[PDB]
């Protein structure tokens, strides 16, 4: 119909041109309709409006996650009949900030050493390869797998890692699998943690699941299972998608990489520019109005859901001059790659650490290049978190 359906099917790094058109329109909030559910939704694409939305206490993230809320995703992201309320269930047990605690600066200082070791080990193995090699399979996959085992869940079997990864790729989708396959993904994940979370949390290590389980009524197995599913969904396809996308951005900008090779102290700024420039989610961050309000003049009624596309905001020319240029020296406002306000990614420091290690491993080795044109890269169509099927590269 004449109301836009959402999302915009921009599964590659080419952002849908619709986002810029909506940004330039006379509306600061645009009504859309969910393709997967038919629910009405509002969509924000301007940086200035997005700041107002994500800093407004009248907009609730948790209320937008509740069953029956208008939503963009085709299937509810919980096992049927369960809360799907992991952060609140941790808060209920007295686990104030266990998430941010176990992912903050002290955790980076524990893990950054082996993270950089592993990035170097992986890249050094690639430096010995002939012909074309795959940076997705042979760099991003082992690095992200080690990240999830060592920092989030505990030492996983290869079969366990393969299983959780498949559940993430199957359930976190707008399309490409059946309804039944999508629910079975969130079923199989929840069933998986109900049985194995206690054992995983009990092994020696610093992993977040152990911290959650071993912090001060006892922690129910349903809450520990909800925490496991939370860490997979929030930590696994995001890190793997982003690292793949960041590598593509670097390979597409050899002049920038040459600068980082010569001046490695500029890597942290390049990390921030990657977080702004490289797209990740194909949907949007969402919030529910808990009372009638106006945002930039547009009246929103209690119960309505307003979305912000982080990609659209990160490419807003009102915020970032030449927004479609990858400019590591950039000194613009804070990017939205980790969101904004109360729900700012609590994994942001760990993510920055793994991104930095990846950038350094690339910048240290001149000659790395994409083996084919960018438009020939194949993409997993329909994922919430963009990811190419492979990244063929050569020296
Ligand atoms: C490059 C990697 C990552 C990116 C780009 C990213 C991005 C984001 C963004 C944009 C949000 C805000 C969502 C919103 O406002 O509704 C968020 C929230 C969150 N992130 Fe990250 N993330 C990454 C990695 C991770 C990792 C490794 C973890 C580890 C578990 C993690 C855990 C979380 C959690 C639990 C939330 C929910 C916070 C809340 O709703 O209050 N993230 N992330
Ligand atoms: C993480 C699960 C849960 N659900 C939410 O809608 C928000 C936003 C969010 C952050 N990371 C995601 C990965 C996949 C889907 C949604 C999200 N916060 C939550 O904690
Ligand atoms: C539509 C299905 C799913 N629902 C969400 O709430 C998150 C919000 C979000 C936007 N960009 C991100 C990057 C990393 C982690 C979370 C997010 N995105 C989704 O795609």
Tab-separated table of C-alpha atoms and ligand atoms in Angstrom:
chain	number	residue	atom	x	y	z
A	1	UNK	CA	0.000	0.000	0.000
A	2	UNK	CA	0.983	3.671	0.242
A	3	UNK	CA	2.393	3.097	3.732
A	4	UNK	CA	5.997	1.902	3.561
A	5	UNK	CA	6.600	-1.671	4.671
A	6	UNK	CA	9.578	-2.239	6.930
A	7	UNK	CA	12.426	-3.303	6.750
A	8	UNK	CA	13.901	-2.210	3.417
A	9	UNK	CA	15.661	-5.431	2.313
A	10	UNK	CA	19.097	-3.799	2.204
A	11	UNK	CA	20.976	-6.995	3.102
A	12	UNK	CA	24.412	-5.876	1.757
A	13	UNK	CA	26.496	-2.865	2.775
A	14	UNK	CA	24.521	-0.712	0.306
A	15	UNK	CA	22.046	1.045	2.593
A	16	UNK	CA	18.524	1.363	1.257
A	17	UNK	CA	18.173	4.760	-0.480
A	18	UNK	CA	14.815	5.052	1.293
A	19	UNK	CA	16.499	6.047	4.563
A	20	UNK	CA	18.015	9.221	3.085
A	21	UNK	CA	14.703	10.085	1.394
A	22	UNK	CA	12.840	9.832	4.696
A	23	UNK	CA	15.587	11.839	6.447
A	24	UNK	CA	15.068	14.686	3.950
A	25	UNK	CA	11.251	14.607	4.125
A	26	UNK	CA	9.101	17.065	6.078
A	27	UNK	CA	8.314	14.521	8.768
A	28	UNK	CA	10.746	13.888	11.648
A	29	UNK	CA	8.858	10.644	12.362
A	30	UNK	CA	7.400	8.567	9.531
A	31	UNK	CA	4.608	5.978	9.875
A	32	UNK	CA	5.507	2.577	8.442
A	33	UNK	CA	4.067	-0.932	8.692
A	34	UNK	CA	5.886	-4.135	9.634
A	35	UNK	CA	6.176	-6.483	6.667
A	36	UNK	CA	6.269	-9.523	8.967
A	37	UNK	CA	3.331	-8.706	11.277
A	38	UNK	CA	1.393	-5.834	9.684
A	39	UNK	CA	1.861	-3.787	12.854
A	40	UNK	CA	1.993	0.009	12.489
A	41	UNK	CA	5.318	1.560	13.480
A	42	UNK	CA	7.008	4.939	13.479
A	43	UNK	CA	10.485	5.394	11.966
A	44	UNK	CA	13.139	8.015	12.791
A	45	UNK	CA	16.124	8.603	10.509
A	46	UNK	CA	17.543	11.974	11.675
A	47	UNK	CA	20.340	12.187	14.240
A	48	UNK	CA	18.770	15.103	16.120
A	49	UNK	CA	15.394	13.389	16.500
A	50	UNK	CA	17.043	10.083	17.424
A	51	UNK	CA	18.893	11.776	20.296
A	52	UNK	CA	15.583	13.097	21.638
A	53	UNK	CA	13.947	9.679	21.310
A	54	UNK	CA	16.672	7.575	22.919
A	55	UNK	CA	17.193	10.034	25.794
A	56	UNK	CA	13.458	10.458	26.569
A	57	UNK	CA	12.422	8.615	29.720
A	58	UNK	CA	8.856	8.334	28.350
A	59	UNK	CA	10.105	5.804	25.751
A	60	UNK	CA	10.592	2.297	27.132
A	61	UNK	CA	12.757	-0.288	25.438
A	62	UNK	CA	11.439	-3.121	27.589
A	63	UNK	CA	7.819	-2.278	26.776
A	64	UNK	CA	8.649	-2.561	23.060
A	65	UNK	CA	10.055	-6.052	23.729
A	66	UNK	CA	6.874	-7.325	25.379
A	67	UNK	CA	4.551	-9.921	23.869
A	68	UNK	CA	1.864	-8.331	21.725
A	69	UNK	CA	3.754	-5.069	21.283
A	70	UNK	CA	3.818	-3.790	17.693
A	71	UNK	CA	7.069	-5.176	16.331
A	72	UNK	CA	9.180	-5.326	13.192
A	73	UNK	CA	10.386	-8.911	13.578
A	74	UNK	CA	8.212	-11.676	12.092
A	75	UNK	CA	8.338	-13.998	15.118
A	76	UNK	CA	8.615	-12.982	18.772
A	77	UNK	CA	12.241	-13.301	19.860
A	78	UNK	CA	11.415	-15.548	22.816
A	79	UNK	CA	10.473	-19.158	23.267
A	80	UNK	CA	6.652	-19.235	23.407
A	81	UNK	CA	5.371	-19.128	26.958
A	82	UNK	CA	8.530	-17.576	28.425
A	83	UNK	CA	9.125	-14.058	29.697
A	84	UNK	CA	11.776	-13.010	27.198
A	85	UNK	CA	12.866	-10.465	29.793
A	86	UNK	CA	16.462	-11.406	30.617
A	87	UNK	CA	17.823	-8.057	31.847
A	88	UNK	CA	14.858	-7.563	34.199
A	89	UNK	CA	15.170	-11.145	35.490
A	90	UNK	CA	18.799	-10.405	36.361
A	91	UNK	CA	17.743	-7.174	38.075
A	92	UNK	CA	15.106	-9.117	40.046
A	93	UNK	CA	17.744	-11.457	41.519
A	94	UNK	CA	19.787	-8.515	42.816
A	95	UNK	CA	22.236	-8.722	39.882
A	96	UNK	CA	22.373	-4.932	39.568
A	97	UNK	CA	24.836	-4.477	36.695
A	98	UNK	CA	26.418	-7.908	36.243
A	99	UNK	CA	26.261	-7.414	32.457
A	100	UNK	CA	28.115	-4.096	32.309
A	101	UNK	CA	30.316	-5.212	35.218
A	102	UNK	CA	31.598	-8.342	33.468
A	103	UNK	CA	32.007	-6.513	30.140
A	104	UNK	CA	33.565	-3.227	31.303
A	105	UNK	CA	37.116	-1.871	31.378
A	106	UNK	CA	38.503	-4.410	33.851
A	107	UNK	CA	37.259	-7.236	31.596
A	108	UNK	CA	38.995	-5.665	28.590
A	109	UNK	CA	42.190	-5.519	30.612
A	110	UNK	CA	41.858	-9.261	31.338
A	111	UNK	CA	41.051	-10.373	27.801
A	112	UNK	CA	42.744	-7.873	25.459
A	113	UNK	CA	46.037	-9.804	25.607
A	114	UNK	CA	44.768	-13.104	24.234
A	115	UNK	CA	42.367	-11.305	21.875
A	116	UNK	CA	45.321	-9.563	20.236
A	117	UNK	CA	47.387	-12.777	20.368
A	118	UNK	CA	44.638	-14.664	18.537
A	119	UNK	CA	44.072	-11.971	15.927
A	120	UNK	CA	47.801	-12.090	15.243
A	121	UNK	CA	47.919	-15.900	15.181
A	122	UNK	CA	45.019	-16.002	12.723
A	123	UNK	CA	46.437	-13.310	10.450
A	124	UNK	CA	49.928	-14.832	10.522
A	125	UNK	CA	48.436	-18.132	9.330
A	126	UNK	CA	46.689	-16.253	6.515
A	127	UNK	CA	49.988	-14.552	5.591
A	128	UNK	CA	51.326	-18.032	4.735
A	129	UNK	CA	48.435	-18.891	2.395
A	130	UNK	CA	48.525	-19.204	-1.375
A	131	UNK	CA	45.984	-17.577	-3.610
A	132	UNK	CA	42.536	-16.728	-2.290
A	133	UNK	CA	41.580	-17.186	1.367
A	134	UNK	CA	38.369	-16.449	3.262
A	135	UNK	CA	38.549	-13.806	5.988
A	136	UNK	CA	35.046	-14.688	7.237
A	137	UNK	CA	35.672	-18.417	7.739
A	138	UNK	CA	39.357	-18.242	8.706
A	139	UNK	CA	39.582	-15.014	10.715
A	140	UNK	CA	36.192	-13.752	11.898
A	141	UNK	CA	34.711	-17.148	12.754
A	142	UNK	CA	37.544	-18.369	15.046
A	143	UNK	CA	38.013	-14.963	16.670
A	144	UNK	CA	34.316	-14.477	17.416
A	145	UNK	CA	33.980	-18.123	18.526
A	146	UNK	CA	36.807	-17.639	21.031
A	147	UNK	CA	35.197	-14.371	22.163
A	148	UNK	CA	31.874	-16.058	22.959
A	149	UNK	CA	33.476	-19.029	24.732
A	150	UNK	CA	36.069	-17.124	26.747
A	151	UNK	CA	34.048	-14.019	27.673
A	152	UNK	CA	30.357	-14.959	27.484
A	153	UNK	CA	29.377	-18.623	27.849
A	154	UNK	CA	32.350	-20.785	28.829
A	155	UNK	CA	34.377	-23.350	26.888
A	156	UNK	CA	32.027	-24.706	24.201
A	157	UNK	CA	32.365	-27.816	22.107
A	158	UNK	CA	32.679	-27.271	18.375
A	159	UNK	CA	29.251	-28.889	18.065
A	160	UNK	CA	27.870	-26.554	20.733
A	161	UNK	CA	29.332	-23.483	19.032
A	162	UNK	CA	27.996	-24.698	15.678
A	163	UNK	CA	24.546	-25.235	17.198
A	164	UNK	CA	24.182	-21.850	18.911
A	165	UNK	CA	25.467	-20.100	15.777
A	166	UNK	CA	22.825	-21.863	13.672
A	167	UNK	CA	20.105	-20.895	16.143
A	168	UNK	CA	21.242	-17.274	15.964
A	169	UNK	CA	21.312	-17.244	12.153
A	170	UNK	CA	17.938	-18.997	11.919
A	171	UNK	CA	15.920	-17.021	14.483
A	172	UNK	CA	17.352	-13.529	13.963
A	173	UNK	CA	15.916	-13.068	10.495
A	174	UNK	CA	13.273	-11.076	8.684
A	175	UNK	CA	12.963	-13.746	6.002
A	176	UNK	CA	14.585	-16.784	4.421
A	177	UNK	CA	13.360	-19.528	6.748
A	178	UNK	CA	9.949	-20.781	7.768
A	179	UNK	CA	8.027	-19.640	10.837
A	180	UNK	CA	8.568	-23.129	12.277
A	181	UNK	CA	12.320	-22.996	11.728
A	182	UNK	CA	12.447	-19.576	13.422
A	183	UNK	CA	10.573	-20.677	16.548
A	184	UNK	CA	12.561	-23.914	16.671
A	185	UNK	CA	15.674	-21.717	16.791
A	186	UNK	CA	14.488	-19.927	19.953
A	187	UNK	CA	13.043	-23.176	21.286
A	188	UNK	CA	16.277	-25.103	20.746
A	189	UNK	CA	18.322	-22.289	22.289
A	190	UNK	CA	16.152	-22.026	25.401
A	191	UNK	CA	15.995	-25.811	25.756
A	192	UNK	CA	19.770	-25.814	25.289
A	193	UNK	CA	20.455	-23.468	28.184
A	194	UNK	CA	17.904	-25.015	30.553
A	195	UNK	CA	20.073	-28.145	30.358
A	196	UNK	CA	23.659	-26.873	29.996
A	197	UNK	CA	23.834	-23.403	31.605
A	198	UNK	CA	24.679	-24.737	35.076
A	199	UNK	CA	27.514	-26.886	33.722
A	200	UNK	CA	28.867	-24.063	31.542
A	201	UNK	CA	28.732	-21.570	34.415
A	202	UNK	CA	30.515	-24.050	36.702
A	203	UNK	CA	33.708	-24.442	34.684
A	204	UNK	CA	36.711	-22.301	35.671
A	205	UNK	CA	37.023	-19.017	33.836
A	206	UNK	CA	35.998	-15.386	33.706
A	207	UNK	CA	33.035	-15.846	31.367
A	208	UNK	CA	29.931	-13.772	31.913
A	209	UNK	CA	27.626	-16.755	32.441
A	210	UNK	CA	29.743	-17.854	35.402
A	211	UNK	CA	29.704	-14.322	36.876
A	212	UNK	CA	25.907	-14.227	36.571
A	213	UNK	CA	25.538	-17.623	38.246
A	214	UNK	CA	28.037	-17.025	41.068
A	215	UNK	CA	26.797	-13.605	42.264
A	216	UNK	CA	24.452	-13.117	45.277
A	217	UNK	CA	17.054	-16.306	46.859
A	218	UNK	CA	19.080	-18.474	44.483
A	219	UNK	CA	19.273	-17.846	40.752
A	220	UNK	CA	16.553	-19.868	39.039
A	221	UNK	CA	17.439	-22.061	36.083
A	222	UNK	CA	14.920	-20.176	33.952
A	223	UNK	CA	16.791	-16.932	34.624
A	224	UNK	CA	20.172	-18.531	33.945
A	225	UNK	CA	18.761	-19.978	30.715
A	226	UNK	CA	17.338	-16.596	29.713
A	227	UNK	CA	20.784	-15.103	30.346
A	228	UNK	CA	22.440	-17.655	28.066
A	229	UNK	CA	20.021	-16.910	25.234
A	230	UNK	CA	20.536	-13.181	25.807
A	231	UNK	CA	24.309	-13.463	25.496
A	232	UNK	CA	24.080	-15.500	22.279
A	233	UNK	CA	21.585	-13.172	20.598
A	234	UNK	CA	23.273	-9.948	21.733
A	235	UNK	CA	26.908	-11.040	21.427
A	236	UNK	CA	27.336	-13.596	18.636
A	237	UNK	CA	25.749	-12.396	15.338
A	238	UNK	CA	26.565	-8.779	16.193
A	239	UNK	CA	30.292	-9.380	16.668
A	240	UNK	CA	30.561	-11.708	13.668
A	241	UNK	CA	28.503	-9.452	11.416
A	242	UNK	CA	30.324	-6.307	12.454
A	243	UNK	CA	33.827	-7.765	12.177
A	244	UNK	CA	33.028	-9.064	8.673
A	245	UNK	CA	31.652	-5.668	7.685
A	246	UNK	CA	34.589	-3.812	9.194
A	247	UNK	CA	37.030	-5.976	7.228
A	248	UNK	CA	35.124	-5.167	4.038
A	249	UNK	CA	35.307	-1.451	4.832
A	250	UNK	CA	39.061	-1.662	5.416
A	251	UNK	CA	39.678	-3.625	2.220
A	252	UNK	CA	37.665	-1.057	0.268
A	253	UNK	CA	39.820	1.819	1.626
A	254	UNK	CA	43.498	0.963	1.058
A	255	UNK	CA	44.603	4.590	1.494
A	256	UNK	CA	43.120	4.575	4.996
A	257	UNK	CA	44.781	1.256	5.794
A	258	UNK	CA	48.138	2.581	4.571
A	259	UNK	CA	47.748	5.507	6.981
A	260	UNK	CA	47.066	3.106	9.868
A	261	UNK	CA	50.113	1.028	8.894
A	262	UNK	CA	52.309	4.116	9.131
A	263	UNK	CA	50.627	5.617	12.219
A	264	UNK	CA	49.238	2.836	14.432
A	265	UNK	CA	48.280	5.313	17.178
A	266	UNK	CA	45.429	6.338	14.846
A	267	UNK	CA	43.787	2.894	15.080
A	268	UNK	CA	41.380	3.783	17.950
A	269	UNK	CA	39.943	6.656	15.886
A	270	UNK	CA	39.550	4.295	12.924
A	271	UNK	CA	37.599	1.916	15.191
A	272	UNK	CA	35.133	4.688	16.010
A	273	UNK	CA	34.786	5.604	12.351
A	274	UNK	CA	34.137	1.947	11.502
A	275	UNK	CA	31.348	1.883	14.094
A	276	UNK	CA	29.764	4.917	12.419
A	277	UNK	CA	30.357	3.993	8.795
A	278	UNK	CA	29.938	0.201	8.641
A	279	UNK	CA	26.259	-0.835	8.735
A	280	UNK	CA	25.116	-3.654	10.963
A	281	UNK	CA	21.425	-4.139	11.721
A	282	UNK	CA	18.958	-4.236	8.820
A	283	UNK	CA	16.230	-3.147	11.245
A	284	UNK	CA	16.022	-0.548	13.971
A	285	UNK	CA	16.341	0.089	17.658
A	286	UNK	CA	12.801	0.458	19.067
A	287	UNK	CA	11.000	1.996	22.015
A	288	UNK	CA	7.389	2.174	23.186
A	289	UNK	CA	5.782	5.388	24.368
A	290	UNK	CA	4.512	4.814	27.905
A	291	UNK	CA	2.367	7.981	27.804
A	292	UNK	CA	1.069	10.271	25.078
A	293	UNK	CA	3.823	12.649	23.977
A	294	UNK	CA	5.212	14.679	21.094
A	295	UNK	CA	8.637	14.233	19.533
A	296	UNK	CA	9.688	17.053	17.179
A	297	UNK	CA	6.033	18.058	16.960
A	298	UNK	CA	4.715	14.620	16.013
A	299	UNK	CA	2.173	13.271	18.486
A	300	UNK	CA	2.782	9.696	19.654
A	301	UNK	CA	0.154	7.857	21.641
A	302	UNK	CA	0.871	5.591	24.585
A	303	UNK	CA	1.540	2.077	23.323
A	304	UNK	CA	2.876	3.075	19.904
A	305	UNK	CA	6.372	1.930	18.919
A	306	UNK	CA	8.955	4.336	17.473
A	307	UNK	CA	12.063	2.938	15.744
A	308	UNK	CA	15.469	4.512	15.037
A	309	UNK	CA	17.662	3.159	12.223
A	310	UNK	CA	21.213	3.492	13.564
A	311	UNK	CA	22.487	3.275	9.981
A	312	UNK	CA	20.289	6.179	8.891
A	313	UNK	CA	21.402	8.315	11.857
A	314	UNK	CA	25.083	7.435	11.374
A	315	UNK	CA	24.812	8.595	7.753
A	316	UNK	CA	22.873	11.831	8.509
A	317	UNK	CA	24.574	14.783	6.747
A	318	UNK	CA	23.158	17.170	9.393
A	319	UNK	CA	25.445	15.384	11.888
A	320	UNK	CA	28.398	14.142	9.794
A	321	UNK	CA	29.712	16.158	6.871
A	322	UNK	CA	30.266	13.880	3.882
A	323	UNK	CA	28.540	11.074	5.830
A	324	UNK	CA	29.125	8.450	3.140
A	325	UNK	CA	32.920	8.933	3.282
A	326	UNK	CA	35.019	6.641	5.476
A	327	UNK	CA	37.178	9.242	7.245
A	328	UNK	CA	39.077	7.853	10.259
A	329	UNK	CA	40.353	11.288	11.200
A	330	UNK	CA	36.746	12.446	11.532
A	331	UNK	CA	35.853	14.650	14.494
A	332	UNK	CA	32.059	14.599	14.373
A	333	UNK	CA	29.523	13.974	17.119
A	334	UNK	CA	29.240	10.633	18.841
A	335	UNK	CA	28.178	7.866	16.502
A	336	UNK	CA	25.151	5.647	17.113
A	337	UNK	CA	26.785	2.256	16.399
A	338	UNK	CA	26.282	1.234	20.045
A	339	UNK	CA	23.021	3.163	20.442
A	340	UNK	CA	22.537	6.002	22.906
A	341	UNK	CA	21.253	6.638	26.394
A	342	UNK	CA	20.206	4.086	28.988
A	343	UNK	CA	20.532	1.047	26.718
A	344	UNK	CA	23.942	1.913	25.221
A	345	UNK	CA	25.622	-1.404	24.398
A	346	UNK	CA	27.023	-2.832	27.659
A	347	UNK	CA	29.449	-4.876	25.547
A	348	UNK	CA	30.836	-1.727	23.923
A	349	UNK	CA	34.284	-1.925	25.521
A	350	UNK	CA	34.764	-5.592	24.663
A	351	UNK	CA	33.511	-4.938	21.125
A	352	UNK	CA	35.900	-2.012	20.712
A	353	UNK	CA	38.693	-4.288	21.937
A	354	UNK	CA	38.029	-7.005	19.337
A	355	UNK	CA	37.527	-4.421	16.565
A	356	UNK	CA	40.819	-2.726	17.452
A	357	UNK	CA	42.674	-6.053	17.424
A	358	UNK	CA	41.188	-6.805	13.985
A	359	UNK	CA	42.142	-3.369	12.610
A	360	UNK	CA	45.721	-3.709	13.896
A	361	UNK	CA	46.109	-7.209	12.435
A	362	UNK	CA	45.062	-5.813	9.037
A	363	UNK	CA	47.070	-2.588	9.201
A	364	UNK	CA	50.271	-4.411	10.127
A	365	UNK	CA	50.247	-6.414	6.858
A	366	UNK	CA	50.419	-4.394	3.626
A	367	UNK	CA	49.041	-5.996	0.482
A	368	UNK	CA	45.819	-7.553	1.776
A	369	UNK	CA	43.007	-6.957	-0.707
A	370	UNK	CA	39.573	-8.185	-1.683
A	371	UNK	CA	39.915	-10.857	-4.386
A	372	UNK	CA	36.761	-9.745	-6.246
A	373	UNK	CA	34.718	-6.583	-6.705
A	374	UNK	CA	32.562	-5.577	-3.704
A	375	UNK	CA	29.329	-6.142	-5.668
A	376	UNK	CA	30.340	-9.799	-6.144
A	377	UNK	CA	30.333	-10.484	-2.398
A	378	UNK	CA	27.411	-12.713	-1.451
A	379	UNK	CA	25.339	-11.812	1.597
A	380	UNK	CA	23.150	-13.871	3.916
A	381	UNK	CA	19.850	-12.327	2.886
A	382	UNK	CA	17.343	-11.601	5.629
A	383	UNK	CA	19.582	-11.533	8.719
A	384	UNK	CA	18.905	-8.895	11.358
A	385	UNK	CA	22.697	-8.425	11.538
A	386	UNK	CA	24.287	-8.192	8.079
A	387	UNK	CA	26.955	-10.738	7.267
A	388	UNK	CA	28.628	-11.816	4.013
A	389	UNK	CA	28.782	-15.498	3.169
A	390	UNK	CA	32.560	-15.246	2.604
A	391	UNK	CA	35.244	-12.580	2.257
A	392	UNK	CA	37.641	-13.800	-0.470
A	393	UNK	CA	40.965	-12.025	-0.167
A	394	UNK	CA	44.521	-12.243	-1.428
A	395	UNK	CA	47.857	-10.656	-0.728
B	1	LIG	C1	30.363	-4.920	17.166
B	1	LIG	C2	29.668	-5.539	18.122
B	1	LIG	C3	28.394	-4.949	18.758
B	1	LIG	C4	27.628	-3.926	18.347
B	1	LIG	C5	27.776	-3.047	17.083
B	1	LIG	C6	26.552	-3.780	19.307
B	1	LIG	C7	25.542	-2.848	19.260
B	1	LIG	C8	24.560	-2.705	20.218
B	1	LIG	C9	23.506	-1.725	20.180
B	1	LIG	C10	23.336	-0.691	19.065
B	1	LIG	C11	22.729	-1.853	21.264
B	1	LIG	C12	21.509	-0.965	21.651
B	1	LIG	C13	20.161	-1.587	21.332
B	1	LIG	C14	19.040	-0.673	21.783
B	1	LIG	O1	19.265	0.545	22.034
B	1	LIG	O2	17.887	-1.183	21.885
B	1	LIG	C15	23.284	-2.951	22.027
B	1	LIG	C16	22.754	-3.436	23.201
B	1	LIG	C17	23.207	-4.546	23.869
B	1	LIG	N1	24.406	-5.187	23.612
B	1	LIG	FE1	25.727	-4.809	22.093
B	1	LIG	N2	26.718	-4.716	20.321
B	1	LIG	C18	27.849	-5.443	19.995
B	1	LIG	C19	28.391	-6.472	20.732
B	1	LIG	C20	27.902	-6.952	21.924
B	1	LIG	C21	28.489	-8.030	22.697
B	1	LIG	C22	29.777	-8.812	22.327
B	1	LIG	C23	27.693	-8.221	23.769
B	1	LIG	C24	27.953	-9.278	24.859
B	1	LIG	C25	26.915	-9.901	25.437
B	1	LIG	C26	26.610	-7.269	23.713
B	1	LIG	C27	25.571	-7.124	24.607
B	1	LIG	C28	24.513	-6.236	24.518
B	1	LIG	C29	23.312	-6.234	25.342
B	1	LIG	C30	23.025	-7.247	26.461
B	1	LIG	C31	22.531	-5.230	24.955
B	1	LIG	C32	21.152	-4.856	25.537
B	1	LIG	C33	21.207	-3.602	26.391
B	1	LIG	C34	19.824	-3.122	26.746
B	1	LIG	O3	18.843	-3.401	26.001
B	1	LIG	O4	19.752	-2.431	27.789
B	1	LIG	N3	26.779	-6.500	22.581
B	1	LIG	N4	24.398	-3.456	21.359
B	2	LIG	C1	19.348	-8.526	23.409
B	2	LIG	C2	17.956	-9.104	23.598
B	2	LIG	C3	16.925	-8.061	24.189
B	2	LIG	N1	15.926	-7.587	23.204
B	2	LIG	C4	15.851	-6.306	22.691
B	2	LIG	O1	14.979	-6.058	21.855
B	2	LIG	C5	16.825	-5.189	23.132
B	2	LIG	C6	17.758	-4.743	21.929
B	2	LIG	C7	18.767	-5.748	21.409
B	2	LIG	C8	20.093	-5.706	21.743
B	2	LIG	N2	20.745	-6.749	21.091
B	2	LIG	C9	19.816	-7.471	20.315
B	2	LIG	C10	19.958	-8.593	19.482
B	2	LIG	C11	18.827	-9.077	18.830
B	2	LIG	C12	17.559	-8.482	19.001
B	2	LIG	C13	17.410	-7.377	19.823
B	2	LIG	C14	18.527	-6.842	20.500
B	2	LIG	N3	17.569	-5.565	24.347
B	2	LIG	C15	17.643	-6.850	24.868
B	2	LIG	O2	18.309	-7.008	25.887
B	3	LIG	C1	14.731	-5.946	14.120
B	3	LIG	C2	15.252	-7.123	14.936
B	3	LIG	C3	16.332	-6.711	15.967
B	3	LIG	N1	15.739	-5.926	17.096
B	3	LIG	C4	16.443	-4.931	17.776
B	3	LIG	O1	15.889	-4.349	18.701
B	3	LIG	C5	17.871	-4.585	17.425
B	3	LIG	C6	18.272	-3.114	17.741
B	3	LIG	C7	19.605	-2.856	17.069
B	3	LIG	C8	19.797	-2.007	15.999
B	3	LIG	N2	21.141	-2.100	15.641
B	3	LIG	C9	21.812	-3.021	16.470
B	3	LIG	C10	23.136	-3.471	16.528
B	3	LIG	C11	23.485	-4.421	17.479
B	3	LIG	C12	22.522	-4.918	18.413
B	3	LIG	C13	21.207	-4.480	18.356
B	3	LIG	C14	20.826	-3.529	17.400
B	3	LIG	N3	18.136	-4.905	16.001
B	3	LIG	C15	17.450	-5.889	15.303
B	3	LIG	O2	17.783	-6.085	14.127
